[PDB]
Structure 1
């Protein structure tokens, strides 16, 4: 029993993290086979950041301007190129610890683990969701750029996020591993702001199922509702609309608990309208939306990885 915000084990990623220095700027890189991936803004000076011309800035660099350190070993850079917003440094040594991996671009609502790093060294791991406005609510300080987000599927590391910047509201923005930003952000210091965020409805329902599995049943009721009546209520409260795909995704949890999806929606509708009135669910006094249906199954069924 029990329910925690659980991250994937980080060991397979820790062995891929390196330190990248260009000029006075040091951040983190991801070393897979013989390529080191890192944010291209590592090539900017203070002068450059209001409106950098990255093609100009890169043509003025040579391989020896990039210092790559894996622990104490220095890696020799033998080529460099830019793909969208990531720099790719070809090095003379293939990482012997390269895991089986793929690069994936995730959608809003999906969750992943972040390995936060400074100077090429892991500081800590935590779980977070891609918000509907394409930011993440992370925890990052100076020097953290290049830290990556990932999932594990059996034996395969799926990299989905590389950290680039913090927005003035204290939330975070970055790219997939092919260098494309999530959201409408750009890697220059121009005024930018996150859109308004919404609550990820399908995840809130998954977490209410987890609560039932763990014995928290006080919010259940005998009613039911329809998708259209539910979605009309949800939109008043800044909740994402529920689709039939979402209903089907929640199938395994509905079956395990014997509570139909649209029954659970009727409970959520009540919680939105009347509130929780100083009661808690799974130790929280707010409705939680950073667990996916798969996260719940994984943690309430005990899935492992190799």
Structure 2
């Protein structure tokens, strides 16, 4: 037992990280088959980032202007193209460590692991959520651009995130692996509104189920509620509205614990209206929303990969 914010094993992704240098700028790239994917702002200087014309900037670059290094191995760039906000560098060698993989665009509220990298070398791995406002609250220092987020299902790596920017507010923004930003953000150093964030209600409920499974039950109460009644409370506390789709995805946890979803909603309602009175749930003094229902089932059932 016990419940931890757990990341996927990162080995399959480590074998794909490379360093990409263009002029004065170095960041991380992702080497899959004979293509290296990286943020297009690798071609920008500090001043370019204030107002970059990427098409004009990229036209001044040739294949030999991109230095790609995999560990100490030098890759030969034989083609380059821009797809949305990512650069695709064709190299003459297929990555022998390419895992089975997919590119996926995840939905707000889904979770993934990030392999933070600098100069093409991994430094750490952590789990986070795509916020409802399409930011992530990561750990990204200068040079971390091109680090990727992913999920693993048995032997298949689903890449869902590539890191591009830190907003002036300190939160993080990036793209899917086709180079489309999550949210309204652009790869330009300018003020960018993220918009109101909200708490991922179905994830909070999943984590309450995880708490019950592990013996934390003080928050279970006498009440029930309706979906509409609960959503009135959700809106007041800036929680995502709960739908029947959410109720259905919580089904297996309700069945294991014997606690109907609307009964758990009534407990959550009381927690929102009355706070936690200085108590904790699974070692947290706040309501946690970075565990999906699938994450909870995974950890409580010992699902494995390779």
Pairwise TM-score range, normalised by the shorter structure: over 0.9
Instruction: Determine if contact 1:85/1:175 at 8 Å carries over to the other structure.
Output: yes
Return the offset for 1:196. 1.3
Tell me how far 1:153 sits from its aligned partner. 1.0
Q: Is the 8 A contact 1:148 1:161 kept in 2?
A: yes
Q: Equivalents in 2 of 1:292, 1:188: separation in Å?
A: 32
**Could you tell me how far 1:52 is from its partner in structure 2?**
1.0
Instruction: Write the distance in 1 (CA, Å) between the matches of 2:121 and 2:267.
Output: 45
Displacement after TM superposition at 1:48 (Å): 1.4
Secondary structure of the residue aligned to 1:164 is strand
| Consecutive aligned runs of 4 or more in structure 1 exceeding 2 Å deviation | none
Of 220-229 and 33-42, deviating more is 220-229
Deviation for aligned residue 1:117? 0.2
Are the aligned partners of 2:110 and 2:130 in contact in 1 as well (CA < 8 Å)? Answer: yes
Q: What is the RMSD computed on CA atoms of the aligned residues?
A: 0.6
Q: CA deviation at 1:46?
A: 2.4
- The answer (yes or no) to whether the contact 1:116–1:125 under 8 Å persists in 2 is yes
Distance 1:255 1:97 in 2: 41
The 2-side partners of 1:73 and 1:160 are apart by 26
Name structure 2 gaps, 5 residues minimum. Answer: none
Cα deviation, 1:106-156, whole Å, max 9, x if unaligned, reads 010000000000010000000000000100000010000000000001211
CA distance in 2, matches of 1:181, 1:96: 29
- The number of residues matched between the two structures is 306
Identify the residue that residue 186 of structure 2 maps to in structure 1. 186
8 Å Cα contact 2:83-2:179 kept in structure 1: yes
More deviation in 30-39 or 183-192?
183-192
Instruction: Give distance in 2, aligned partners of 1:88 and 1:14.
Output: 19
Gaps of 5+ in 1: none
Q: How high is the TM-score relative to the length of structure 1?
A: 0.99
Distance 2:217 2:105 in 1: 36
CA contact (8 A) 2:167 2:191 kept: no
Q: Is the Cα contact below 8 Å between 1:168 and 1:193 reproduced in 2?
A: no
Q: C-alpha distance in 2, partners of 1:251/1:32?
A: 37
